[PDB]
Amino acid sequence: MVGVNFFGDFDLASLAIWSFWAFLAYLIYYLQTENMREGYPLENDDGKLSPNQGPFPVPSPKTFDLADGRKIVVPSVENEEAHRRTDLALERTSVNEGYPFRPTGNPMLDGVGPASWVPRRDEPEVDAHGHNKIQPMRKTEMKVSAGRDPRGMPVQAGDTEVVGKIVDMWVDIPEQLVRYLEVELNSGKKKLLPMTMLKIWSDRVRVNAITSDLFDTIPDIKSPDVVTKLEEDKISAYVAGGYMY
Amino acid sequence: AEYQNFFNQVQVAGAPEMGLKEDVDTFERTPAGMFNILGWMGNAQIGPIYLGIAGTVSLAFGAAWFFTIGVWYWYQAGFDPFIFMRDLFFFSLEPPPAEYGLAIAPLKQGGVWQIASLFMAISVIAWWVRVYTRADQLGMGKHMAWAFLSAIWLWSVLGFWRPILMGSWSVAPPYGIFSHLDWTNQFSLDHGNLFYNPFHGLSIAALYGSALLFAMHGATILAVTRFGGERELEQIVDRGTASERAALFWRWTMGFNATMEGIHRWAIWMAVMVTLTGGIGILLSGTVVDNWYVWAQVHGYAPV
Amino acid sequence: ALLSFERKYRVPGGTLIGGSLFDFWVGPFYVGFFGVTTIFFATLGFLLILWGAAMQGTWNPQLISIFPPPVENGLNVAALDKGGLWQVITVCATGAFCSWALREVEICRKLGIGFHIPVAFSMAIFAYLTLVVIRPMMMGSWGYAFPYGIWTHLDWVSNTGYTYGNFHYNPFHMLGISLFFTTAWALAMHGALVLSAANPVKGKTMRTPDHEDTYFRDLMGYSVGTLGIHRLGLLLALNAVFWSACCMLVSGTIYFDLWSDWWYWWVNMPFWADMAGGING
Amino acid sequence: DLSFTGLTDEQAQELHAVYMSGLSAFIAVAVLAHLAVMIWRPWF
Amino acid sequence: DLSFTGLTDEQAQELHAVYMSGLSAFIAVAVLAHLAVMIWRPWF
Amino acid sequence: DLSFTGLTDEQAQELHAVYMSGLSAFIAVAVLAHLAVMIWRPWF
Amino acid sequence: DLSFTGLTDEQAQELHAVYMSGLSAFIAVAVLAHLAVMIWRPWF
Amino acid sequence: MSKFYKIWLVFDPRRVFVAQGVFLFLLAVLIHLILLSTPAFNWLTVATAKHGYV
Amino acid sequence: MSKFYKIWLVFDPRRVFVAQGVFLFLLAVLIHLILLSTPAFNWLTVATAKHGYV
Amino acid sequence: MSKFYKIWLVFDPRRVFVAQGVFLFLLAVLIHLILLSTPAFNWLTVATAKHGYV
Amino acid sequence: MSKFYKIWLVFDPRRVFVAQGVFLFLLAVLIHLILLSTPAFNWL
Amino acid sequence: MSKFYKIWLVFDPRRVFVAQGVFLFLLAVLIHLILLSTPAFNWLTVATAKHGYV
Amino acid sequence: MSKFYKIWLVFDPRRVFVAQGVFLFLLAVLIHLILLSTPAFNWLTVATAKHGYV
Amino acid sequence: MFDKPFDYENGSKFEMGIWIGRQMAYGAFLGSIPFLLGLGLVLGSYGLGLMLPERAHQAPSPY
Numbered sequence A: 001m002v003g004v005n006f007f008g009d010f011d012l013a014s015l016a017i018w019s020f021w022a023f024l025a026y027l028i029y030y031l032q033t034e035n036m037r038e039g040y041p042l043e044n045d046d047g048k049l050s051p052n053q054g055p056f057p058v059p060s061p062k063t064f065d066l067a068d069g070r071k072i073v074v075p076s077v078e079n080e081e082a083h084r085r086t087d088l089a090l091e092r093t094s095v096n097e098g099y100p101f102r103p104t105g106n107p108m109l110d111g112v113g114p115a116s117w118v119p120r121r122d123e124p125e126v127d128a129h130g131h132n133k134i135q136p137m138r139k140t141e142m143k144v145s146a147g148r149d150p151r152g153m154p155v156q157a158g159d160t161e162v163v164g165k166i167v168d169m170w171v172d173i174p175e176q177l178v179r180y181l182e183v184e185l186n187s188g189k190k191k192l193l194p195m196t197m198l199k200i201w202s203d204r205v206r207v208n209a210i211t212s213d214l215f216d217t218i219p220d221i222k223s224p225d226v227v228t229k230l231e232e233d234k235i236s237a238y239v240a241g242g243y244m245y
Numbered sequence B: 001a002e003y004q005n006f007f008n009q010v011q012v013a014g015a016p017e018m019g020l021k022e023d024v025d026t027f028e029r030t031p032a033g034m035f036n037i038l039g040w041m042g043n044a045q046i047g048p049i050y051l052g053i054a055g056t057v058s059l060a061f062g063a064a065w066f067f068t069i070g071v072w073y074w075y076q077a078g079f080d081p082f083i084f085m086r087d088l089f090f091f092s093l094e095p096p097p098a099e100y101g102l103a104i105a106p107l108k109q110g111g112v113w114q115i116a117s118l119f120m121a122i123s124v125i126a127w128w129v130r131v132y133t134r135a136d137q138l139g140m141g142k143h144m145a146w147a148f149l150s151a152i153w154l155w156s157v158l159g160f161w162r163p164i165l166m167g168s169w170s171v172a173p174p175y176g177i178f179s180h181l182d183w184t185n186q187f188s189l190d191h192g193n194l195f196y197n198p199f200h201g202l203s204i205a206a207l208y209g210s211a212l213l214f215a216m217h218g219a220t221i222l223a224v225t226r227f228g229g230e231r232e233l234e235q236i237v238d239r240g241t242a243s244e245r246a247a248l249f250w251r252w253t254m255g256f257n258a259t260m261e262g263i264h265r266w267a268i269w270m271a272v273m274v275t276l277t278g279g280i281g282i283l284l285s286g287t288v289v290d291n292w293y294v295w296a297q298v299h300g301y302a303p304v
Numbered sequence C: 001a002l003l004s005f006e007r008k009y010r011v012p013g014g015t016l017i018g019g020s021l022f023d024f025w026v027g028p029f030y031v032g033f034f035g036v037t038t039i040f041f042a043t044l045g046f047l048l049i050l051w052g053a054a055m056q057g058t059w060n061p062q063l064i065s066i067f068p069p070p071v072e073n074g075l076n077v078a079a080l081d082k083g084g085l086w087q088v089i090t091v092c093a094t095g096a097f098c099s100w101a102l103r104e105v106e107i108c109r110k111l112g113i114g115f116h117i118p119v120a121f122s123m124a125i126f127a128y129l130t131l132v133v134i135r136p137m138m139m140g141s142w143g144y145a146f147p148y149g150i151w152t153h154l155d156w157v158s159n160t161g162y163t164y165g166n167f168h169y170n171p172f173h174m175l176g177i178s179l180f181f182t183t184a185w186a187l188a189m190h191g192a193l194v195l196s197a198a199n200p201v202k203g204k205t206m207r208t209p210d211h212e213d214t215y216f217r218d219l220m221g222y223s224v225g226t227l228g229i230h231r232l233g234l235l236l237a238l239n240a241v242f243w244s245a246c247c248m249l250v251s252g253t254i255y256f257d258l259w260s261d262w263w264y265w266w267v268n269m270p271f272w273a274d275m276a277g278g279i280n281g
Numbered sequence D, E, F, G: 001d002l003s004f005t006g007l008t009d010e011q012a013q014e015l016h017a018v019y020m021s022g023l024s025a026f027i028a029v030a031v032l033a034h035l036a037v038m039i040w041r042p043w044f
Numbered sequence H, I, J, L, M: 001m002s003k004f005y006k007i008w009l010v011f012d013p014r015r016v017f018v019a020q021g022v023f024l025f026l027l028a029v030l031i032h033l034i035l036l037s038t039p040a041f042n043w044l045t046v047a048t049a050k051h052g053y054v
Numbered sequence K: 001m002s003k004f005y006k007i008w009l010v011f012d013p014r015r016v017f018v019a020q021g022v023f024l025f026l027l028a029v030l031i032h033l034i035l036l037s038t039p040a041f042n043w044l
Numbered sequence N: 001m002f003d004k005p006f007d008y009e010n011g012s013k014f015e016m017g018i019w020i021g022r023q024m025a026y027g028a029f030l031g032s033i034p035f036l037l038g039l040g041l042v043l044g045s046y047g048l049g050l051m052l053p054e055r056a057h058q059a060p061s062p063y
């Protein structure tokens, strides 16, 4: 088929390349539509429906079947409503669109900006067997196999002060990964510190995200041995918000 | 100075996970162990492996192909272990010459190449069946098999379909370290600057895009590991602040963003595209277009 | 417009320069001072490429090409009609890329996340600067950089590679090729695995990460993990680009002959060089 | 009336009147420029 | 009586007056430069 | 009698009337341009 | 009293006066440099 | 048919208007480029020949 | 027809004005560059030939 | 029209001023670079030819 | 005019002063680099 | 058949209309380009030959 | 068979119809292109030869 | 530490001028950072090339 043209200079290679262009256009449309299952429809600064919604329509709903019988329809009103924050302590800085919203009170306590948390379901994440995915090491038979064990180390904050000591570690059992450190403060209360936002030195655990005064207001877990997804989100948001605040 | 989460600060380990049963025959699973060196960046467990029929066929025929190439190299070295090491990257198992066409060639003149190629094809088909069946028995969606099929498509175009269309096994690449690089360069030279093959350019674009997209996605996930962003499936069913912050970063950066699930659709299609377009580009070379620079001149993207 | 969850994240702060002077959004785009500079540099570069197309006399997008000044010009600032336009466009591109990285840094600071994305982008910026600045200056002229054209820079790649015979024999080049192939393979596997866990066989409930670990342990006897696979993909891409940059850095500066000839020290080691037989006699 | 953007009918009328004045000025300037170019260097 | 920016009518009028003064100065300088260039190096 | 958009029949009628007026203006301008081109340089 | 900066009118006037004085000084220095260059190497 | 207005009961006006504007601009550009790439109907080339500009 | 003002009931003026400004700027620049790329209508070239600048 | 001031009732002056400054500087730089790319209107080369030092 | 001081009621002067410093330095650098292109004004 | 209307009980009318429009436009463009690629049916070439252009 | 209708109890009608439409269009285009590549069955070439167009 | 606010109320003219000068000097330093980085990159690469063997400056043109 060398030099065999259907018309003009249009040969098999031309047909292949034009067919690829059409297929790529359709593929781009499909990929963009598949990524519009969260966060839509668009809103304005007042929370009302935006007059402009984009050229791509929102796809038809799809259902995720969970192991415990719960159904999640990701592009649905229920999904958006379950993950919507209410009573946000925020204020518009301008009548125009596109300007930042000013925190009215304490942004870290109110959970706005870089301290924002999402109201996830107030249940622990489970594995395929139904057991809680994240458990303290005192409830398991795991042992430290490498690295430095932080249990018993002092905890130093970003202001160069000692706020407590590490008493236990919380481990992702299916993944065999340490995700949180449990710290007993000098006041006797116990908090959870994300592993991804601390450093383990030879003699201490350093947390530069927050200062000593903020350690007492870290969000708490209802049960001493179980942490839920909502509690995880709140703790992570509080700790990460310290970099700006 | 902050923790970048590239390596674990501390490792923990208990009994190794032997895997979910589902519809899998646990008799075919081997024992498991631990390797602490692998636990710094990933998992330390060298977990159980499924044996089965497809795995056994694939292992046997792949070892046969490997050993066929090895014994051909030893023959080319004349039994000398010192010559074997001195010229290891220069040894080559070449396809039959163009005179024999597609027929079975004498052993010294491409028959060994044909035997090795048949063993390799059997091994690759068995491994594809293994991928599909391991997905099926756990109740998963067969995406890995279809992704593997694109690479198989490029591989079979290089060695089977294009040689059949050209009428001889001689146009297939040889089995050798330096020799197949020479084959690649000679293919480009013979077909007139393969740079001007449009599907070659599409494949290069897809490869660059795969590197770019994996860099973007890995950096994004590691950036939101503060909020458990690497737990992607739970974020898919129960959206957290990690997904929202990632989406907002990319929306504020380039005006549009993805979701925790659809980013992987982007990834799989971008990675599939390189082999999907490369197979077409190779198949068109010699069968439809024999000089891509002249073709580019005709079709208006090369100077006249 | 805003996403349904976007309002609580649009807070002031995080800028590097200007405070609240440019701390606003235009549509979905956060602007900032570096966004202002990015828009200026990008628009100037695009309009100068169009003007260079006007000077060239062609409006075919696949034939437009802006060439650097000739090798004989050295490191001098060339006339705009004799390669200076290429230098202006190069300055605009460098400014736009750096401003984009700094704007990404600002967006990271506002959202309270890490800087992995701007660091990874800086790696690609380093590769680009290697191809247009570091290597041409180490070779003594702007004329060794690639032109700004969709296929003419492919011609530049071809000529540069064939300057040293078959460029496949560059060792850092082999390493970069292997890393790029590994990156594509890992991206395919990761996308497929996540999608197969999220979209199981019809009638089955959604799969867990335990299913993914079991699948990859069954298939090949090892699972790297979700955190592990993300780390591995990022490192693979960064190393691929870095070693490609090194391969181009060593070529034409400390090595000038054929790389296929470089590979012959192993063969020519005297203790087996004269041993008859094999490929190399 | 139907209004996706939230504007009223009279607000739309006033805004359109101002927009039409601006467009008329733009078109008048363009027509004068085209007349000057046609006199200086006709393209037909 | 729509106001997307929150400004009143008289505030908009004052801002426009100052903006038009600035634009007039800019255009006058541009006209002087163009006349000087036309004398120095005509392009028509 | 379906409404995916939420409009009423009369709102759709008004919208169509305005749209048809705009389309008629556009088509009339295109027809005049085509007649001018045919007079200047016929293609048949 | 339209202000986006938290500045009073009189503060703005005084700041503008100081800024314009400095701007005039900068213009004078630039003019001296341009005259020196023109004497050394005229570009017209 | 007098019932074509019912298309607005099916399609949202905003997306339709945006797509129509983009489509019309691209179509006009395509036709103009096709004419310009043909020297017999390139009005600049015809004007140059008619008035002896080059 | 005198009911075109209702377009502002469909599209927000701010977005329309921004898009129109971008479109007009790009179109004007493109047409000017097309004329400049043609030596017959490049006014700088015509002036150079008329006044003997080179 | 005497009612053009109402544009400030539509667009925020700060962002308008930023965009206008960027656009005007970009346009001036573009026109100067276009003139410098043409040897007939490159005033530095013109001065070089007129006075004759290089 | 005399009402230009109101620009300081729109943009905060300190950030504006920093941005002006950046712009002026980069403009001077650009002009020097442009002068380097022609040998007659190459001062190196 | 007289009950083809039931197709609208299976497929959403909006998606069908969009796909049909895209398909028809692409088909028309393809046929026009096929005719333009054939010199005997290139109406621009026929007009050039008949009216003596170029 | 009089029981073929039960195929609709096995496969979703929407997917089947979409796939069938795509397949039929691709097949028809392929066959037409194959006929066009053969000068003995290219109807445009036959018309050109018959009417003496070129 | 470099970009500081001014106390307009209870602030003299001389201090205001000095403050404006300091703000503009800080802006100039910020704008000089990329110029100095680019100049250093170019000149250091050229110097390294000067320290390279003689064949580094004799490569065939890729055009």
Ligand code: BCL
Binding pocket: B200, B201, B202, B204, B205, B206, B208, B209, B212, C045, C046, C049, C128, C131, C146, C150, C151, C153, C154, C157
């Ligand atoms: C890396 C080593 C070589 C090189 C070797 C090759 C080879 C070999 C090939 C390409 C190909 C391409 N290269 Mg190159 N390329 C280099 C440097 C560059 C640079 C740069 C500033 O550094 C850019 C922007 C490009 C751009 C491009 C694209 C036109 C194309 C597909 C890339 C792609 O999808 O990437 C991944 C990125 C994405 C998927 C995201 C989208 C990126 C888009 C497509 C970029 C479009 C750029 C546009 C045409 C021009 C930009 C300027 C305009 C004023 C905006 N190259 C250097 C010199 N490049 C291929 C091709 O088809 O060429 C015709 C090809 O075969």
Ligand code: BCL
Binding pocket: B124, B151, B152, B154, B155, B158, B184, B185, B187, B188, B193, B194, B195, B199, B200, B203, B204, B205, B207, B274, B275, B277, B278, B279, B281, B282, C157, C181
């Ligand atoms: C001088 C040489 C020529 C040239 C000649 C060719 C030729 C010839 C080919 C390519 C191909 C490719 N080239 Mg090229 N190429 C050149 C310049 C470039 C440049 C550049 C200058 O920067 C780039 C970036 C590329 C990039 C690329 C890729 C995009 C493309 C496919 C890669 C791939 O996945 O391969 C490797 C991946 C595979 C082979 C898939 C393998 C699948 C099987 C099933 C897996 C292995 C089997 C079995 C499991 C093995 C054993 C494993 C055991 C564990 C031991 N080329 C120049 C112009 N290039 C290919 C292509 O598609 O072109 C259109 C191709 O055939």
Ligand SMILES: CC[C@H]1c2cc3[nH]c4c(c3C)C(=O)[C@H](C(=O)OC)c4c3nc(cc4[nH]c(cc(n2)[C@@H]1C)c(C(C)=O)c4C)[C@@H](C)[C@@H]3CCC(=O)OC/C=C(\C)CCC[C@H](C)CCC[C@H](C)CCCC(C)C
Binding pocket: B058, B059, B061, B062, B063, B064, B066, B067, B123, B124, B127, B128, B131, B144, B145, B147, B148, B150, B151, B271, B272, B275, C181, C182, C184, C185, C188, C189, C192, C219, C220
């Ligand atoms: C989207 C395209 C990309 C891609 C995709 C891809 N590849 C894939 C997959 C996917 C999605 C799989 O599912 C599949 C897989 O299982 O991955 C883990 C596979 C895979 N891609 C592979 C390789 C591969 N992919 C490549 C490329 C790419 N694959 C593309 C970039 C390349 C390149 C660049 O050349 C290679 C080499 C394998 C790791 C795997 C398929 C495994 C397979 O086919 O196995 C059968 C073959 C053999 C058994 C051959 C023999 C192996 C040994 C040499 C046997 C002899 C040794 C003996 C066992 C020991 C001897 C010891 C001593 C006595 C010496």
Ligand SMILES: CC[C@H]1c2cc3[nH]c4c(c3C)C(=O)[C@H](C(=O)OC)c4c3nc(cc4[nH]c(cc(n2)[C@@H]1C)c(C(C)=O)c4C)[C@@H](C)[C@@H]3CCC(=O)OC/C=C(\C)CCC[C@H](C)CCC[C@H](C)CCCC(C)C
Binding pocket: B208, B211, B212, B215, B216, B219, B253, B254, C038, C041, C042, C043, C044, C045, C046, C049, C089, C090, C092, C093, C096, C097, C100, C104, C117, C118, C120, C121, C123, C124, C147, C148, C149, C150, C151, C153, C237, C238, C241
């Ligand atoms: C780990 C390194 C890999 C990587 C990483 C990477 N790239 C990135 C990122 C990351 C992590 C981003 O965050 C950033 C981004 O925002 O992505 C969406 C980016 C990005 N990677 C991009 C492209 C890109 N990356 C590439 C490569 C890779 N990037 C590597 C493989 C390539 C290749 C190989 O060709 C391309 C084309 C962009 C989509 C984006 C950066 C966007 C940007 O800079 O925007 C500002 C600039 C403009 C809008 C336009 C400027 C235009 C110029 C002023 C004029 C043109 C000059 C140019 C030199 C002409 C070239 C002509 C060509 C024919 C040569």
Ligand SMILES: COC(C)(C)C/C=C/C(C)=C/C=C/C(C)=C/C=C/C(C)=C/C=C/C=C(C)/C=C/C=C(/C)CC/C=C(/C)CCC=C(C)C
Binding pocket: G018, G019, G020, G021, G022, G023, G024, G025, G026, J025, J028, J029, J030, J032, J033, K027, K030, K031, K034, N016, N017, N018, N020, N021, N024
């Ligand atoms: C490629 O294109 C080229 C480059 C060829 C041409 C393009 C050119 C352009 C577009 C050039 C410039 C455009 C502009 C807009 C340049 C700058 C205009 C301005 C507004 C310059 C501002 C200068 C203001 C300066 C230095 C600040 C002076 C204030 C100084 C300290 C602080 C004020 C304090 C003062 C105390 C009192 C001291 C003064 C006295 C008299 C005691």
Ligand SMILES: COC(C)(C)C/C=C/C(C)=C/C=C/C(C)=C/C=C/C(C)=C/C=C/C=C(C)/C=C/C=C(/C)CC/C=C(\C)CCC=C(C)C
Binding pocket: D002, F011, F014, F015, F018, F019, F020, F021, F022, F023, F024, F026, H020, H027, H030, H031, I004, I006, I007, I009, I010, L025, L028, L029, L030, L032, L033
């Ligand atoms: C090489 O191949 C070639 C190019 C030769 C093939 C040639 C191909 C084709 C395929 C050419 C075109 C096919 C078409 C389909 C052309 C366009 C036909 C149309 C559909 C033209 C539409 C014109 C519509 C116009 C201007 C819009 C009129 C609407 C105007 C403002 C909007 C008014 C409506 C309004 C405002 C809303 C206000 C009312 C209320 C109640 C709010």
Ligand SMILES: COC(C)(C)C/C=C/C(C)=C/C=C/C(C)=C/C=C/C(C)=C/C=C/C=C(C)/C=C/C=C(\C)CC/C=C(\C)CCC=C(C)C
Binding pocket: D014, D015, D016, D018, D019, D020, D021, D022, D023, D026, E002, H025, H028, H029, H032, H033, I020, I027, J004, J006, J007, J009, J010
């Ligand atoms: C390859 O093809 C080529 C390029 C050769 C030819 C193809 C060419 C085309 C297709 C060219 C153009 C097609 C068009 C459609 C160009 C644009 C025509 C338009 C529609 C220009 C619009 C100009 C509008 C202008 C100046 C008006 C801007 C409006 C204003 C000043 C008025 C301000 C309005 C309102 C201020 C504020 C009211 C606020 C209150 C509170 C009442």
Ligand SMILES: COC(C)(C)C/C=C/C(C)=C/C=C/C(C)=C/C=C/C(C)=C/C=C/C=C(C)/C=C/C=C(\C)CC/C=C(\C)CCC=C(C)C
Binding pocket: E014, E015, E016, E018, E019, E020, E021, E022, E023, E024, E026, G002, I025, I028, I029, I032, I033, J027, J030, J031, J034, K003, K004, K006, K007, K009, K010
């Ligand atoms: C080669 O040919 C090419 C391709 C270059 C042709 C392309 C050409 C174009 C596109 C040329 C230009 C089109 C335009 C749109 C040029 C510019 C028109 C304008 C509108 C220039 C505006 C200059 C505006 C100037 C100086 C005003 C700046 C305003 C001010 C100082 C005053 C604002 C300060 C204020 C108002 C006080 C407000 C605050 C209170 C509290 C009242």
Ligand SMILES: COC(C)(C)C/C=C/C(C)=C/C=C/C(C)=C/C=C/C(C)=C/C=C/C=C(C)\C=C\C=C(/C)CC/C=C(\C)CCC=C(C)C
Binding pocket: B066, B067, B069, B070, B071, B073, B074, B104, B114, B115, B117, B118, B120, B121, B155, B156, B157, B158, B159, B160, B173, B174, B175, B176, B177, B180
């Ligand atoms: C001491 O060492 C021992 C002896 C133990 C082993 C040492 C072994 C070595 C050194 C093994 C291998 C060295 C190499 C260099 C192996 C291969 C590397 C490569 C680069 C293999 C590349 C194959 C590359 C491509 C395209 C092949 C694609 C192959 C195909 C589709 C297969 C075609 C299948 C069937 C053609 C043809 C069936 C038809 C008939 C008539 C049988």
Ligand SMILES: [Fe+3]
Binding pocket: B217, B221, B232, B264, C190, C194
């Ligand atoms: Fe992922």
